[PDB]
Amino acid sequence: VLYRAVQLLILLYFVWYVFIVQKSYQESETGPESSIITKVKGITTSEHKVWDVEEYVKPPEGGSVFSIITRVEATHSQTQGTCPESIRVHNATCLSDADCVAGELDMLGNGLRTGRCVPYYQGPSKTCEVFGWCPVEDGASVSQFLGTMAPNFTILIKNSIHYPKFHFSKGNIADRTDGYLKRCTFHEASDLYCPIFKLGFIVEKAGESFTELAHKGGVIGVIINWDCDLDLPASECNPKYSFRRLDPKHVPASSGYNFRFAKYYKINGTTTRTLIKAYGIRIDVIVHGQAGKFSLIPTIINLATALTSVGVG
Amino acid sequence: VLYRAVQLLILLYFVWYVFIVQKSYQESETGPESSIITKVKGITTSEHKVWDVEEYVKPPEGGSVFSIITRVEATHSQTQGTCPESIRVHNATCLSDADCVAGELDMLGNGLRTGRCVPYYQGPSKTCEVFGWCPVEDGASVSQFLGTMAPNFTILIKNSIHYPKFHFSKGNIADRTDGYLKRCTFHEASDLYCPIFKLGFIVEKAGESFTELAHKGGVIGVIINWDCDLDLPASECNPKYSFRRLDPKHVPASSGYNFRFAKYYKINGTTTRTLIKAYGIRIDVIVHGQAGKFSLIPTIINLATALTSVGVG
Amino acid sequence: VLYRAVQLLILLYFVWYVFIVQKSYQESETGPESSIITKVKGITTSEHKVWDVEEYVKPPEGGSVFSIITRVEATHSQTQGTCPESIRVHNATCLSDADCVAGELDMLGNGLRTGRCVPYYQGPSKTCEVFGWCPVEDGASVSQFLGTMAPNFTILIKNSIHYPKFHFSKGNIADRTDGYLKRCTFHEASDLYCPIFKLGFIVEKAGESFTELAHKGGVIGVIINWDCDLDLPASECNPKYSFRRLDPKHVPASSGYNFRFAKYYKINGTTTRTLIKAYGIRIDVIVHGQAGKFSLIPTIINLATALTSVGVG
Ligand SMILES: Nc1ncnc2c1ncn2[C@@H]1O[C@H](COP(=O)(O)OP(=O)(O)OP(=O)(O)O)[C@@H](O)[C@H]1O
Ligand SMILES: Nc1ncnc2c1ncn2[C@@H]1O[C@H](COP(=O)(O)OP(=O)(O)OP(=O)(O)O)[C@@H](O)[C@H]1O
Ligand SMILES: Nc1ncnc2c1ncn2[C@@H]1O[C@H](COP(=O)(O)OP(=O)(O)OP(=O)(O)O)[C@@H](O)[C@H]1O
Ligand SMILES: *[C@@H]1O[C@H](CO)[C@@H](O)[C@H](O)[C@H]1NC(C)=O
Ligand SMILES: *[C@@H]1O[C@H](CO)[C@@H](O)[C@H](O)[C@H]1NC(C)=O
Ligand SMILES: *[C@@H]1O[C@H](CO)[C@@H](O)[C@H](O)[C@H]1NC(C)=O
Ligand SMILES: *[C@@H]1O[C@H](CO)[C@@H](O)[C@H](O)[C@H]1NC(C)=O
Ligand SMILES: *[C@@H]1O[C@H](CO)[C@@H](O)[C@H](O)[C@H]1NC(C)=O
Ligand SMILES: *[C@@H]1O[C@H](CO)[C@@H](O)[C@H](O)[C@H]1NC(C)=O
């Protein structure tokens, strides 16, 4: 019968292509509840100085977002007082006391102007004197590179996801009594459940240079995808790891990532601070997920729609 | 032919209204990967005191969420020791040593009770003595307003989005060799790609008063929407900026935003701290996005559905 | 008429089951803009020491994610210098100076090796000497439990959601002139709008033991669901609170949550720090929401589809 072959072709076209490829027989949940616990390990050395994780990882609480400091411009022994203003500030440069007016407070400056013209930190120029945190970084900062051994650092990312509808839970570390998580190196295939990543590895998979990113700074995403079919065993629900840079790489106006922080002390009853401008690599751990599980209602509805299409066709 | 006009009307109704208005010929991705780098600039003065960004912006790392401090209640020279308890604490007020019992520890109090009744910081009342961080803020705090020039502060928000499916990337700062990002003021039309916002501007677009929000505190969202049609040039994919308050504005029980933080020192071998209760404006940078790009599969499926509807009709 | 009863049955089956149960007459927005302001209250005591919220809550800014410290391993008077390395570090243990080689820098160690073998902190063993932050925690740390009264702590979670499409806004605290938010205890039914939760309560609703979670640490999600039908009064749009643990509870390799932070001082011109390893309970406040409101377009489209199905059937 010609109709036999015609309908055999029609059915298979709308069966193997509708209920198989796109899984019309499944209800879905997009976006699981996730916990990210992070921990960085590794120590680096500058000139007669050893840096530990506490110093170069900020914030310290071990969450999804953190910055590993690779370079600092540090200004020591900063106290409230009078000092020459940065030559980089508008109208700062002066030739006589008459060129500076008292009380003026530029937002982009570094204090309140005194009405005097004082010699700059490095001569021979002169610059308007201000009251504020002194000395200013643009005249007393020292640079330290502490990203020399940062490619050898290690980050442990612990993730556990939950799909409330399906009541499904899976983590990225296996229940193993041996010391696997202490002698293991992540491999997307052989060691997918050792979620310990070197920073150099992460920077290689984002397609970036460790040197450029260590001097200007930047942001690298670590993306974990949980695309699981629950009609199958939980052993098939596994994490997929992706590494890409998130911040612009061609923007010349703002090229990189940086932040300032200070350390406050009291020397002889005077509040003193060391200001640090930190360039570093920020690590975003972003978690995506999509679970699918058989449900009778959607299956029946889609079967009815397919039967209607067959009847029309 | 009457059928000619009938079908001409029917088709246009389900063509210009189905594949044009709602763009049935497009696959979509909702929710891009985003990076937010923030930086606040501006300095403010209190009584013989200049405040910089490091002091009034917390946390300092330059992310999506940060608080600009506008007012502080500060308690200086706090040490572990004995002091009268706040008159604001239940059962704290006493007339004789018999009214206070030793060892009691109220969670809403400020230390461990000693069993004695001592004069309050400001007379003539008496209050039960406690062991803890002393003196208590409700008896030794001084208030400082540092939001006087906060409307003139500036926030630079750098955003770059990524749609992995489409492999589309766009940022909110243009590749310009000139010093545009150094002499530019955001304008939703003329300067949409100078993402430098004054706080006063943000507070005007949220419909709020800077004074009320500076004394009680609050939360303002900065919403960036990326609604892009990829069938068009990337020059059509642009950010849309919105400013609205996120926290309740009529709640009298909890009206505002505040947090406490302390600064720890060691004076003569004794751990001493200055406790700061900070009221301020928290800035949430929230990023929404929806990209659409032509795909043949959805177009064919929707065309088949439209043809079926036409056939029935 | 038989057809009368047949169509009466058919219609009700596809009316009470299509436009009622699944609300086909509604357009939807999934995912509202939310603000979370948190504040923890409660003080705890260790041996001759009173801890306040500033010490045990990190970070302090009052956001969606924060950690309440329950146990610390603290190492005091740490200075850059030479000290024996932790016996827990590979190859650290030595019998003579020849077993240690100078310059070697293990990432999992605690400094730079000097080439000498020195007695360990606790005898009789000997371990290779390193330069770094000294002494090392594994030889000078003291443990403090400060989770004794943590179940009695209180967390105030303030939430306000916004659905931009519907321009709908609702918060979780009512506009009440009385002191309700000062004498109230959350009850999912009687006091759903007192969003002040004890930590013990939260840990009881997650199904966990406060002791196990206080010594190893962990992560508890506080989930707020806003499932609102806008065709009804705003008094029907209410929060639904759920409490569940987010981190794995059977993983032996990594069981818990911890982070390290340090406190920096200057004693006699020398930078000195107290390193704290903190175990605690991290609180994730996660907000889900789904609003539905009548729209004519979807209603007409779904009615047309239902009529087509009826005609075919
Ligand atoms: N909050 C802000 N307000 C105004 N201008 C800013 C702000 N943040 C940065 N800029 C300016 O924009 C340009 C690019 O920003 P970026 O912070 O990357 O550069 P920078 O030179 O490293 O910053 P800095 O001013 O700290 O040296 C710089 O010239 C910087 O001065
Ligand atoms: N974690 C908490 N547990 C119990 N009560 C709280 C908590 N946080 C705030 N409150 C109380 O709820 C009310 C409103 O909160 P809010 O913090 O806005 O007020 P406040 O007076 O500024 O707070 P504070 O108690 O720090 O003075 C205040 O009376 C405050 O004491
Ligand atoms: N970033 C990291 N790189 C390598 N190994 C790690 C890292 N973080 C943790 N580990 C190791 O994995 C195991 C489990 O992690 P976890 O931090 O829970 O244990 P821990 O013993 O409390 O950590 P610590 O090493 O601080 O004592 C521990 O043996 C720990 O040393
Ligand atoms: C300050 O800058 C403005 C703008 O360049 C300039 O016109 C003015 O002369 C400057 N002030 C002085 C005292 O020169
Ligand atoms: C890790 O350290 C080794 C030497 O110990 C070095 O050869 C290697 O390049 C480092 N890995 C990097 C830089 O990614
Ligand atoms: C403590 O407060 C309770 C409740 O108000 C009160 O009954 C009790 O008398 C108070 N304690 C003393 C010693 O008065
Ligand atoms: C910015 O500063 C000017 C004075 O320099 C002031 O007139 C203006 O009101 C400020 N902007 C505000 C408060 O939004
Ligand atoms: C260092 O460790 C390796 C690996 O266990 C070992 O082979 C080597 O002998 C150790 N170094 C010394 C000096 O023993
Ligand atoms: C709260 O404190 C009381 C004593 O004041 C105690 O009995 C109770 O167990 C505490 N709640 C806990 C531990 O959840």
Author numbering:
A (entry chain C), B (entry chain A), C (entry chain B): 43 to 355
Give the original sentences from the paper that presented this experimental model.
The P2X2 receptor (P2X2R) is an adenosine triphosphate (ATP)-gated ion channel with few small-molecule modulators that exhibit poor pharmacological properties. Each P2X2 protomer is composed of intracellular N and C termini and two transmembrane (TM) helices (outer TM1 and pore-lining TM2) connected by a voluminous extracellular domain. Three P2X2 protomers intertwine to form the trimeric receptor, with each subunit adopting a dolphin-like shape, as first established for the zebrafish P2X4R (zfP2X4R).
Thus, we refer to conformation I as the canonical desensitized state structure and establish conformation II as an alternate ATP-bound desensitized state structure. The triphosphate tail forms ionic interactions with K81, K83, K200, R302, and K319 and a hydrogen bond with N300. Further, the 3’-hydroxy-group of the ribose moiety interacts with K224 via hydrogen bonding, an interaction unique to hP2X2R. One helical turn more cytoplasmic, the narrowest part of the gate is formed by the side chains of residue V354 from each protomer and constricts the pore to a radius of 0.8 Å, thus defined as the primary constriction gate. As a result of the deeper gate compared to the apo closed state, the TMD architecture in the ATP-bound desensitized state now adopts a “cone” shape. Unlike previously observed for hP2X1R, hP2X3R, and hP2X4R, the absence of cryo-EM density for any ion coordinating ATP in the pocket suggests that free anionic ATP rather than an ATP–cation complex is the physiological ligand for P2X2Rs.
